[PDB]
Every structure is written in structure tokens, then in C-alpha cells.
Design a protein around this nucleic acid. Structure first.
Lengths: 349, 350, 349, 350
DNA sequence: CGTTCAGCTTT
DNA sequence: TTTATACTAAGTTGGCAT
DNA sequence: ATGCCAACTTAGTATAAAAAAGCTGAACG
DNA sequence: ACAGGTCACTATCAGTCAAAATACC
DNA sequence: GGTATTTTGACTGATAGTGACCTGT
DNA sequence: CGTTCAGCTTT
DNA sequence: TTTATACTAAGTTGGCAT
DNA sequence: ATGCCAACTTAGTATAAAAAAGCTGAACG
DNA sequence: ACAGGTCACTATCAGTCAAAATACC
DNA sequence: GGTATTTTGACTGATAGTGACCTGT
């Protein structure tokens, strides 16, 4: 040749210049102006080294006014702190944000793409953390909605994302399985078995269980104000689960002598238990039982459903619903769900 | 002014450094020394902003029917509301929210009023814990803007993108024991206060309606009430009796006609009709005087109606409570029936 | 002076030229270029004569591609014809369109303003035809939505309009009033009284009433398939309205002898009646009764509500609801509405 | 090419008439003879269109990750659906709708695909009365577009602005008398058809599940069915009996094991399991052979389940019908319970 | 005692 | 025929530190 | 034995604009 | 010594307003 | 006579170039 | 008799 | 506390024409 | 007497995407 | 006679593609 | 040797000026 043509740039028969993106291999037309052609090509080949943009003035102006992701997330945390949400709730959010920080760059909100967000989320889905994905997506979407209401963005680049599937893996618990575990929990601290009984017979959540004080029992009724919902109920000490042969009263007595503390359930040192701990030992006794389940094993919380289902058949739907504290039927008809374990025997009633 | 091919918005520095100046912010931007490139991008940026510079006075015939100011508009919006045909009280609620807007936003051209600005104001209210207000102000702001859009003074409603602040009712409920206790503190107060309290609980009516019951509204064992708030028309049988508080509607009425003596069932010492505000106010006096303590905001006279509902719900029937209160479907009831965290659900083995 | 300055155009101290709209009185800046200034002013003063635009090329291009209101409405009628709607329904729509044709110009859809639409609607509201306004608005909005789904517009300039108030003026009918009318209907053709009885006792709509054939009564049940809803019911001839002393059976007998035709209700010539006619004579007997009502008087249709309300108290809510054919409770709880006439006596039940 | 200050898109005629030519339509526009004015407006119009002409190959780095074609995309969209983890049948339903799209739209760049075009296709289906299809095709089209937006191949979903066509079910219901009549025509058909018909009515199960009941699914007076469609798991008591049709589940099963003899309760003459399509098909044969006439579309084998539901609803209970069918809440039931205009509501004096 | 204005929260 | 939605508040269980 | 952080999966609860009141500190007679 | 850009400050923009000038019933 | 509508020019809050002037390196 | 493919309508 | 929404299908009653 | 058009006010009925089937004319052995 | 604009038709756009040329492990 | 990535130029479906040429007046 006889050319200064820089690489990537070709000249055609008429003298028409074209660039060739080497990543796509598709070319681009420049014109006949070799001076301008080369010029642009140089600037294009410099972008191939590193991605530093001779960014237009337009974009520059839109950007230096508008707000950055991580910066918005700092602000966002402040918004939540003000929603009047419970501490745990805030803890959860913080977590999702933390994830968002790891997953997305700190660039102009307006410049985070649906594609980018999508990529992150699938990242969670491919590790099998579909749940986390759904939640993260949610949080991000809400952070965006807020970015919108304070007028930093204008549209929600997430509203466009694949809101993950919601398959529930934890297996339900059958009465028999309960018994087998109950037995395996022989070599476990005394409070476990008791915890377990108290749980099924009251149908309260582990959190609330572990906070029940003897001073909450007045005239044969156990007063409970549920931490998660604020529902307030009085449970008659006179309950009985005929199917498992559990008596609330009898069980309350064993707790009184064997456990003795201010809290109905207590440690070997007469001190209150962390709900996690209780959950933990149940798990242990469960492994020690050596039972087999499809997918994920039942957990301590599953005693609630077992309670409800057991009181469903022994007493009534309504009782079960009241004992659990569901103002809504959507929830009650969900604890009534067997999740593939049991066959619904159709009665001619 | 010049000796330059320099397009607008681009200034040259003493060294020959070219920068674009955004006119919206007034902050400038660095380009480099390559005037050819500098101007080039400046033109492109000028196209994004001030596309052109010209406006055929024809374009005057366009942007004309457009230019108006928030306050000059609020002024017009008021008159609109005046023709809407709404009750005096409502209009008052509205006018107030407008006023808040007037003190919260600049009198700029509607078109220039930012979502960001609005939210800023709205958040001002939320941060002072006046969330309730924030909602209503937002609500009204949105309505004004709509109307301006109707008259094509704007194209877009910038309020819409903003969200409504959610706010949990604070006000606490009133338990029978508490009522009794308040009633006791009532002894220093006028005779009518007690009678009002009793009547309020037994009849379950709104204080506004209570204050307007006349003796002529009683016929053949029935107290006729046409509710001022909703237009619901009911007749209450003068035979009711609250068991938990030992109140007799007959007896209470009786005490009323002998002691109070006036054209209205409740009446001032001066034997004249009472304002609903006063009934409330005096009750509030008693409540303080009773020294009770509550979570959140303290119960007010309107809480006597919820107590009423709740007691009747048990003594008689849910169905009854509804009818007494004057609730049309099966929905608004499920609200007065609610005790908002004051009661323990005694589980029966049924 | 020493100027050709055209009218409306002033020159300021620096030599700055301004136009003055004479309708607003606000001025407009042109520049220092007297040649251009005048030029533009001329073109502006010519627009003051008539409104003919030296319309830009931009608008010209957007317009000659896009679609016209009346033209869209012609098309629109075709869309409805295809929705599978009943004839009356179509008749109503046609009407609203006709109104739209009278109310709005035949210009580019994209160029009909919220303001213009608004103006029309208020026009109806000020004549006191609030109802019509609501319906028109509706129709127009739907025509627009359709213009949107076939990609002619992009936004619904109506979604922004004041959807009118919906006050219902027609007064309900009390049993007494029924009686007084029933009596006033002495000098009216025999079929009126009968119509009236049959109506209250069956609770069917006038349309359906006037189409009942003797061949629709099998084994003591009156078979009815309601024209407006397609509901199908069988009414026992054994009904009775104790409050008005009406017997369905007795009434059916009088119709058989005195009226005799294929249709249960018939004219003096033994021929079927147009529902309008029946409505008309009721009205007449109503005037002749000389009763006074607040707002609008009751009409024949109000016998339905009276029927329902009467059967509510005599028999049951459920019966009344079934007899009327309401699958929904929203409707039934609406015929239960007294509309300011009667005081709901609270029973201790 | 020229000797002209003429900007692009503006051509001059032999008389000296200037016109702008819209490049999108290709139709030109008249301006006049005033070249100064002509060009002026042409520039303004050129700014609205092709703002500029330049694209820093930097702008290549932008529009690159953008350009893709409907069919090249449908190709990619397929593979996506393949990873979605859906049942074979579903995927099949989807692939079909894609195919319709492939035959209905040009293989143009996504960005260029108009709402107007889409609707045009969609209306094509509606006008042939295939409304049902129109809905589903629309639905899937929308999903594909979303996915492309996710991969930033487009910015906007042009399907969204389009509406879903509403379509009333045509298919008529099956009355007990009709069933009987069809059963009678069945005599020419295989022995299994009748047995299937009976079993279908008595058990109220989906034909797909019927065909897969094995004799081993019966234990201690109970027929266990895990529904293929929904995963619902039920046990049917082999004691049921439809009164209006004189069917005995025991008897019908009995006839089955003696006559049919195969591993499945219903079985082919060849003593092998039957396809659900065939059961349906043969029923359809009978229906024609019976000579009955109906409004709208004729009843099919799946209509035996509605008959089932309806009869049981009366004979036993609404509650029962639900449980038999396998319906979780209190909602999906209120559908099978519906007779869609086949029955007269006998009014009782209750 | 008891009223009207205002700015907030509740039906 | 089934589910979705937008928040909120847990429960589950692996680890590292006492 | 144990206690507390951290990343994940699961329970729980439900509309939003209009319209109309009701509450209560001030200033006032 | 300089990239990068903030900052007060005039000369003109762009236009409002209230008398003076003048047209219309 | 008596009101309404242009001219006209004094008077005023904005803008956009300007060169002086901060500042992190 | 009985199967799979396809294009439509229904759960 | 009450209402909204998006269609669809009537009923109501004034007139002009038989 | 009446019948049919026309402009108005009132009744009536309710989600929309995913997922999974079921129906039935052809061509085929 | 002309406003207003449609219509086929080249010369170049703008770029794809598959060998030739050449660089990289 | 053996694969991958530039050059290069023949080859191709688009576009935008063009003057000839319809048409309602």
C-alpha cells in the first residue's frame, strides 16, 4: 500500500472508508473524508484499549446533575429507617442492599440497564438461590420506585425483570414423624421434648414460644401477643392433642418442675432460650431420627402446621385458625396445605 | 458580542481553553483546546437544549394558552372547587390543603414545578410525623394539576409519580373500665357531659348527630336520627341497655329531659343546643382529669362509639352493632368492630 | 415616524423589535433584524384575519400519515359491530358517537385536546345531562383506547377528564303509593292494573313481562329467561304479596279471561304490548294519582324494587335475590336501598 | 451531488418548485418557491428526523448491543423457554404461538415492529373468530418482547399497548338426558367407551387421569388419583352412586375388570392402556351418531366432568362436588358448578 | 362556660 | 384452573469465638 | 456445652381516591 | 505553569406598565 | 361627548459573554 | 381400531 | 366511611305520523 | 286510540397473566 | 400554464462475504 | 506444522437526487 490508514479501517473502490469493529466483525461507514475517517478511527481504536469514553457533552450534562446507585442506596437506607418498620425487617432490607452493592456498579441510576440487573438476578438463580433473587429484585425495585418519587430517575428499569419462580422446598411434618423425632430426642436436653410438645399443643411460633413467661398464665389461660404480627390471644391450658397424646396442662407441669425459670421454656441453668437454639436442637434430633424426606427436611416451625392440621381434624377449622391468629383465610387455607404428603380422603358429608 | 465563530453557551478562557456552560445549572464544562471539536459538541448540546432559537410568533399562538403560575392557578382551582357542589366542611378541608401548598411551593410556572420539589415538600410533612396531612396535601395537589391539564396549562401531572405516605392510626381505644373511670372524673364537669357520655355509648351515634337530636325526634319508643355525615336514616328503640356499663336508654333520656330541659336532647346549661366541638373538648378535660395512661394517642369522644359498637357486638350481635352504627354493606363495620390491639382473643374449645 | 413597521410591532430604544399580540396584550421579542421582524409580523397579522397556518413541515408530516377523529369513529363503529354486543347496546353506542360527532371537530386524533373534550362534557353537565356526559366520556375514552391499540394515537387524552358525578334522581316507590296509583288506574285500560300486579308479584323487568307467553307456564311454574341478562328462572304461580293483597295465581286468572292472547299481558285487541307503552300508561296513572315526590317521580321499573323490598320482609333476602336473578350481591344490596324514603327500624335480633 | 445549498430531503422542480420529501413515506411535500424559507423549514424537519448525520463509531458501541431481528430473536426466545422448566405440553402450546408469530410478522428489526402491525395480525385472528388464539398469541408475543428488553435489544414493549381479546366460551353443556342418549348411541362403539363414560361421570376426573388409573390404585375401598394437571392428590371412595343416571362405581369398576382386563382400569381391546385423545374422539363419534343438537359448540368428553359436578352438587353437596373435582380454595369450583345457560332456576318458597 | 379559627388526624 | 403483588417479619442453619 | 453474626428460605398482611368528621390548642368574651 | 471550572459584573435581552395618541360608537 | 385600542418610551428583572480569580497537581 | 401432528379452544 | 371502573343493556318519556 | 324514532337516565356484570388440558380433522398402518 | 406531487431510474451508499495475506501458539 | 485474525476487493440490497411525467384547475 501507500496508506496511513490505521488498523480496523478499510477503504473501498470508490474511496469509501469503513471501520471494522473487530469484536463483531461488522463494519461501519465513515464517508469519503479520509481526514475525518482516520480521526474517528484513531479515537475508536483508543476505546478498544480500555473503554475510556470521549463521552459527549450531552451525556456529561445529564450525568453530573443526576444521582449514583450506591449513593442512592445510602439515601434509601434512610428512607426505610423512617417507614416505621420492625428491626428484623430492617435487618433483612440491609442485607438485600448489601447484595445489591456487590452485584451492581456505582453509576448513574439512569444508566443501570435491565440487562445488568437481570444478569445479577440470574446469578443468584444459577447458584440455586431463587428465593434471594426474588427478594433482591423486590428490594431493588422499591429502591427504584423511591428514586422515582424523589425525581432522580423517571422509569423503573426493574419492573421489566423476570420475577423469579417461588417453589417451596421444605417438607411438611406428619404425626408419625413427629413421634419418631420425639423419641430420638431422648439424648437431647430435657427442654427440647417439652419445647416440642408446647409447640404443637399451642401452635405458636418458636420466637413467641421462647418468650412465654409464667406470669403470662392467668386463671387457666395462656396469654400470648405474637411478636411477628402483634396478634393477642388467650389459650386455655386445657388443650389436648389426642392424636399425639399431648396434654397442654400436663406438659406445663413438667416444664414447671423439670425446667423452672421465669420463662416457660428454660435452659438447664434455668435461663431463657434463644429461638435459634431450639430450632437447632430440633434439627439435630431430626438427623438422629434418620427419617428420609423428599427435598428439604421439615424444621421446628413445621410443628405449627402439624398443630393446625391436627386441631383441624380433632376440633375445627375455626379453632385452628383462631389458635394460630390469622385474620385472613388465605393463610389458614395455606397451613391446611399438605404439600404432597397426604391424600385428601373424600367423605360423603 | 464577539469576534468568534463561537456558538452560544461556549466560552473561551485566557489560555484558549474552551468550555460549555450549561445554562440550567450555570456550571461550565471542560472540552479542551481543539476549537473544531469543542464547537462541534457544543452545537450538538445546543440542539438538545435550546433546539434552534426561533419562534414564529405562530409558536406564540401555541405556548400562549399554556403559561400560568402555581399560585395564579391555585387561585383559579379554588373557584373550580367552589362550583363542585360539596359540603361546606369538605371545601374547608380542601382550602386548607391548598394553603399548605401555597406555603410549601414557589409561585413558579406550573410546567417548571418538579416532582423532586413536590416530594421535598411532601417529605417535609412526613418528617414532622404529619403523614396523614402529607397524603391529603398530595391528593389535592394532584387534583389541581389534573384540572390544569384539562385546561391544557400543562401536559403532565408531576404529582402522579410521587407516592402516598402510608400512616397507621395512632389513637387508642377506650375500654369499659376506662369509660367508668372517666365518667367518675366527670363529676366536676357539667351535667350534660355525663349524659352525653352515656347517650353516646348507648346510641352509638356520631357526636355531631348527638348534639342535634331534638325531643321531637322521639316517637312511639323510637329515636329518629338522620345521620349528617352519610345521610343514613335510622330509628333507635328507646329500650336499649348496655349491660357492662349499666346504662338504660330510657333512664338516661329521662334524666335528660328533667335535668337538661331544652329543645335538644343534649343541651347547654343555658338550656341551648351544644356544639360538637365542646362536647369533645369537655370529654378531653375529663380524660386528663382521670389520669389514665394510654399507648399512642389518647381516646377521644368519638371513641365512645367504638366502645359502643364493641360492647353491643358482644351483648347483642355483630349484626346489631352494624345496624346501630349506620353502615350500609358488610365492609365499614369490620372497622368499628376492630379493637386495634386492646383485646386478648379468648380461645374457646368450640 | 419614519417606519413601515406593520401594526402590532413595536421598536425599542436599542432597536429591539417586538410583536404584540392584541388578544393577550403581551408582547413578543423578534430581534434587531427589522427585515426578519416585519416579515414575521406580516405572517402573524395574516393569522389574525382567519387562523390559516403557515403550518410547519414537521406537523405537516406527522398529520398526513395519522388518522382523523370522525374517520376513526367510522372505523370504531366497525370494531363494536364485532364485539358480539346486543342490538340495544349497539344502539346506545351509536348514539354516544353521534353526540361525539356533533361535539368535536374532524381533526387529527393526536390533536384533540383534553381541554376540548372537557369543554364538550361540561356542555352536557351545564344542560343538566350529567348522565349523558358520563356515558359520552366513556364511549370517547374507549374509542381512544381503540385508536391506541391500532396504533394511531399513543395516549388517551380523555383519561385526564372529569368523570362526572353520578346522582340518581328517580324516587323509589312505597306500597301505599302503589295502592294509590293502582286505584287511579281505574280509567286506564284493563291491562295496566294487571301488568302492575304481575310486575310486583314476579319482580321481572317490563321488557320481560311483556314477552311472557302462556306457553311459558308448565306445571305451576312460570318460566322466564331475562332478555337483559340471559338469566333463566322458574317462578311458582303460588306467590302472594300479603302487603298488597296480590295473588299471582288469581292475577294470572284475571289475565286469562279479561285479556286472552298468546302473551300473558295483552292489548284490548288481544295483541302483545310494547314495553314502552306499558311504561307510558303507568306514568299517566301516576300523574292522575297526583302524588308528590322529591326530585324525579317513580317509574314502572320501580315496581321491581318494591317487589324485592316487599318479598325481603315477607319472605327472605335470598328469595328476593333469586326472584330477581342477581348472581351478584352488589345488585341485591342495591335494590335493598330505600333512597331516603324509609327509616330502617332497628330490631334487637 | 449538486450545485446547491439544498440540504438533504429537499428537491427542486423544473419550474423552481421546492418540496421536502419525507424519507419514511417517500411522499414529498410542497413548500413554495421561496428557497430561503424552503430550506429553513427543511432543516427544522431534518432535525426532527435524522438529527445530524454523524455517529462517532463510539455510537457504534451503543447501537451495537441493540440490533436484532424478530425471527432471529424468536430463535433465541425458544431456547430461553427451553430453560424455563415447564411441562412438555406447556412448551408445546408456546412453541405453537411462536410459530403463529413467525407466519404473522416480518423478520424485521425488533425496534421497527409497530404496535399497528401487531394489532393487524392479532385482528387477523379475531376476525376469523379465533379470538382465543388471539389472546394467547398476544400473550406470548408480549413475553418474547419483554425478554428482548431484558437483553436490552429494545427499550419499549409495543405489545403492551395492545389489548387482549375477550372471548365467551362457546362449548355447550351436557344434560343427564343427553348423556343417556349418547350412551345409547355408544352401542356400536367399543365396550370401553361406555365404561369410560360411566366412570367419568361417577368419578368426576379429567380424561387424562382416567386413562392412567391402574388397578393397583385401588386399596381398601379407595381409588387413589394424583391429578396430572394440578398435582392434587385424592382418594375416591368406591361406593359412590349417581342417582339420576343409575351408575354404581363398584359395579362399573366390576364390569371393567371382567370385560376390559388390563393393567389400567380403562383399557383398549388389545388389553393395553388408552390415549386420552382416543377416549375423547370416540365419544365425539357417539355424539354425532346420537343426532342430538346443541347451541354453540357441541359437548365433549370433558363435559362429562361438569355433568358429574352438577349432579353430585345436587345429590350430595356443593362441598362434595368441589372435593371430588380437586379444587383447592372456594373459587375454581364456582366454575364447574356453573351450567352456562342450560338450567332454569326453580324458585322455592324458602 | 362556651364560641370560632386552624392545623392535624380519622372515619 | 392456578397465580400473580408489595411490603414486612420470621424461621433455618452454617460457622467462628468463648 | 454455648452465644451471637450472616446468607437463605418462609411466613403473614393486604386498595386508593373522594367526602365528611372529629380533636384540640389558642385567643376571646 | 495549567487543566478545570467558579464568580461577580456589565451591556443588552425581552418585556411590562402606565400615560399620550388615536381610533370607534 | 365617552369608551376602547394602539403607539410610545421610561423603567425593570433576567441572561450570556467577560476577564479576574480560586484550586488540586 | 388406534396413533401422532397441528391448530384451536378450555380449564 | 364511601366510592371508584369498564363495559353492556335496559327503562323513561317527548314527539310526529297514522 | 296507537306505533315507532330519539335523546336521557338507570340497571347489571365483573381481573389478567401463566400453566396445562382437552378437541378434533388429517394422514397413516 | 402551474401548483403539487407521483414515479421509475441510475450512481453511489454502506456494508457483507468469502478468499488472500498475514499474524500468533 | 496448524489455527486465528486482519486486508482486500468482488459482489449486492438500499437510498437519495434526478428529470420525465401524471392531474385537478
Amino acid at each position: 500500500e501507500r496508506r496511513d490508514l490505521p488498523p480496523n479501517l478499510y477503504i473501498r473502490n470508490n474511496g469509501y472508508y469503513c471501520y471494522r469493529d473487530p469484536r463483531t466483525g461488522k463494519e461501519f461507514g465513515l464517508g469519503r473524508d479520509r481526514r475525518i475517517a482516520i480521526t474517528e478511527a484513531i479515537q475508536a481504536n483508543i476505546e478498544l484499549f480500555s473503554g475510556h469514553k470521549h463521552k459527549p457533552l450531552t451525556a456529561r450534562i445529564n450525568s453530573d446533575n443526576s444521582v449514583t446507585l450506591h449513593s442512592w442506596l445510602d439515601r434509601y437506607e434512610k428512607i426505610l429507617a423512617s417507614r416505621g418498620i420492625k428491626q428484623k425487617t430492617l435487618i433483612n432490607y440491609m442485607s438485600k442492599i448489601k447484595a445489591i452493592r456487590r452485584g451492581l456498579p456505582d453509576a448513574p441510576l439512569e444508566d443501570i440497564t435491565t440487562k445488568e440487573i437481570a444478569a445479577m438476578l440470574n446469578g443468584y438463580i444459577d447458584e440455586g438461590k431463587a428465593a434471594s433473587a426474588k427478594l433482591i429484585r423486590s428490594t431493588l425495585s422499591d429502591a427504584f420506585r423511591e428514586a422515582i418519587a424523589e425525581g432522580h430517575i423517571t422509569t423503573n428499569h426493574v419492573a421489566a425483570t423476570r420475577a423469579a419462580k417461588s417453589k417451596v422446598r421444605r417438607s411438611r411434618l406428619t404425626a408419625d414423624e413427629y413421634l419418631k423425632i420425639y423419641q430420638a430426642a431422648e439424648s437431647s436436653p430435657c427442654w427440647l421434648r417439652l419445647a416440642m410438645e408446647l409447640a404443637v399443643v399451642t401452635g405458636q411460633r418458636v420466637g413467641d414460644l421462647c418468650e412465654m413467661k409464667w406470669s403470662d398464665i392467668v386463671d387457666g389461660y395462656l396469654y400470648v401477643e405474637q411478636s411477628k404480627t402483634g396478634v393477642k390471644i388467650a389459650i386455655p391450658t386445657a388443650l389436648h392433642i389426642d392424636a399425639l397424646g399431648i396434654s397442654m396442662k400436663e406438659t406445663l407441669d413438667k416444664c414447671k418442675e423439670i425446667l423452672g425459670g421465669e420463662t416457660i421454656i428454660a435452659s438447664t441453668r434455668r435461663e431463657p432460650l434463644s429461638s435459634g437454639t431450639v430450632s437447632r436442637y430440633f434439627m439435630r434430633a431430626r438427623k438422629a431420627s434418620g427419617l428420609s424426606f423428599e427435598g428439604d427436611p421439615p424444621t421446628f416451625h413445621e410443628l405449627r402446621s402439624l398443630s393446625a392440621r391436627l386441631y383441624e381434624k380433632q376440633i375445627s377449622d375455626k379453632f385452628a385458625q383462631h389458635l394460630l391468629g390469622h385474620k385472613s383465610d388465605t393463610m389458614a387455607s395455606q397451613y391446611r396445605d399438605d404439600r404432597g404428603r397426604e391424600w385428601d380422603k373424600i367423605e360423603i358429608k
